[PDB]
């Protein structure tokens, strides 16, 4: 149908979550569905144990990837009244959230309600300090873009030249934590490959190494983000406090599961 | 040593090099509160709307982090470090008493 413009007058959709996390979930759920379809072809009693092994390995890999790519390591969130934009004295009541990951930080500004001052306040901005990417350039582009005041404030708090040294410590922590998480992913791949091979003890050792590298990345992130001088983030009449987000706890739980399974494999091999 | 210049200038004759101003060109009290929001937060005590002070309420906080105050060594005695340099909005506020 034509004769009218535009041919499609509906509002354009927005993807409801992170695209990287969504892609990881889709890929691993597709693998899970394929192996569930394959399940009736498995021989006999070794199906529930096979199911547990497959699901556990897939969960370990998905945890490694999602945690390495999740900007949810150091999280904080405060409800305040803050100035919204330039050339406007009106204030907004909103939840401002900080989500510092390995490669950058996501600053969220969600209105309460979302529709305030005849505007939709659901900002979710990313500022990345990954190797080869210039954080100062991204902050300058945000200033030119005209992002709301809380977003700009929390973004400049992580600039390399800001008096509180969040940028240096967080960049170092994220870089080396991501490196060790990639090492853990490689060890998980090798653990699967060598659990396919008849030498199960070496595969258990590689799984143990995966757990150890997860714990090492966790500890390095903790130590490097602890060395920060206290940066007071004050918005409106409140202070924002960051804490280890669910990415940190998923790292801890997955690493503990991997080290426990590796120790169990080694001890069972020794005892059998 | 040559000063900071606008990165978008100084490469071709029609757009020669132009110096970059390291403070806000406005007469906006930036020498008192700083030329950035993080600077102002570093200068505040967040109590009763006052600029942060040290043990003596008549003097601001001593400078600790190297990112805060210009710390040129004393020409006379050679004394260096932020041990006795106060924190102001202007980075070079301790150039002389």
């Amino acid at each position: 149908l034509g004769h009218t413009f535009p041919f499609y007058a509906g509002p354009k959709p927005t993807f409801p979550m992170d695209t990287t996390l969504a892609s990881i979930i889709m890929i691993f759920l597709t693998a899970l569905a394929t192996f569930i379809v394959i399940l009736p072809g498995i021989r006999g009693k070794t199906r529930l144990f096979w199911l547990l092994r497959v699901v556990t390995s897939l969960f370990i890999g998905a945890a490694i990837l999602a945690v390495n790519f999740s900007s949810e390591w150091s999280v904080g969130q405060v409800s305040t009244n803050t100035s919204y934009k330039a050339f406007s004295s009106e204030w907004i009541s909103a939840d401002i959230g900080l989500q510092v990951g390995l490669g950058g930080v996501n600053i969220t500004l969600t209105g309460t309600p979302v529709q305030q001052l005849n505007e939709t306040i659901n900002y979710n901005e990313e500022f990345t300090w990954r190797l080869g990417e210039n954080y100062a350039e991204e902050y300058a582009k945000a200033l030119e873009k005209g992002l709301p005041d809380p977003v700009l404030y929390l973004a400049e708090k992580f600039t390399p030249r800001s008096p509180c040294g969040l940028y240096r410590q967080y960049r170092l922590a994220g870089h080396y934590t991501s490196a060790m998480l990639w090492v853990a992913f490689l060890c998980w791949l090798l653990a699967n490959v060598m659990l396919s091979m008849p030498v199960l003890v070496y595969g258990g050792y590689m799984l143990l190494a995966t757990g150890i590298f997860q714990l090492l990345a966790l500890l390095f992130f903790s130590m490097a983000t602890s060395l920060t001088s206290p940066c007071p983030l004050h918005l409106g009449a409140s202070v924002l406090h960051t804490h280890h987000g669910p990415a940190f706890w998923i790292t801890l739980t997955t690493g503990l599961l991997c080290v426990l399974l590796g120790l169990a494999m080694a001890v069972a091999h020794r005892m059998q | 040593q040559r000063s900071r210049w606008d990165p978008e200038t100084g490469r071709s004759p029609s757009n020669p090099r132009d110096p970059a101003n390291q403070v806000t060109g406005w007469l906006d009290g930036s020498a008192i509160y700083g030329s950035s929001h993080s600077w102002s937060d570093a200068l505040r005590s967040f109590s009763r709307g006052q600029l942060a002070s040290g043990p003596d309420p008549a003097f601001p906080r001593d400078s600790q982090n190297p990112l805060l105050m210009w710390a040129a060594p004393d020409p006379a005695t050679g004394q260096n470090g932020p041990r006795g340099l106060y924190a102001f909005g202007a980075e070079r506020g301790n150039r002389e008493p």
Binding site: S83, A86 | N21, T24, G25, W26, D28, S36, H37
Partner: peptide
């Protein structure tokens, strides 16, 4: 009523001029 009844001036000099947001700003 909010005691801050005006638009608080920015510390970095941005958004002071309506159409030239970099005017008078730090680094300009």
């Amino acid at each position: 009523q909010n005691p801050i009844s005006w638009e608080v001036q920015r510390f970095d000099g941005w958004y002071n001029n309506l159409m030239e947001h970099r005017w008078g700003s730090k680094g300009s």
